[PDB]
């Protein structure tokens, strides 16, 4: 449930989670289809699963 951002991701709404390359994100929900939910720096939202790598 711990992943590291491979790329920057810029949220397009407040359902989505922004992060920078190298940020550590904690996965809160795994679904298939290319989107996971996670939390970073007190915010929770969805992000592309192929934008991160498991630690």
């Amino acid at each position: 449930s711990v992943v590291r951002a491979k790329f920057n991701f810029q949220q397009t709404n407040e359902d989505e989670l922004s992060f920078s390359k190298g940020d550590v994100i904690h996965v809160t929900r795994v679904e298939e289809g290319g989107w996971w939910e996670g939390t970073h720096n007190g915010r929770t939202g969805w992000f592309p699963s192929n934008y991160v790598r498991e630690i």
Binding site: K6, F7, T12, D15, E16, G33, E37, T44, W46, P48
Partner: peptide
């Protein structure tokens, strides 16, 4: 507490 729905849009491609 209510959680955000999974995006309906397709996941974006990784930056090239």
């Amino acid at each position: 507490p209510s959680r955000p729905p999974r995006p309906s849009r397709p996941p974006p491609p990784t930056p090239r």
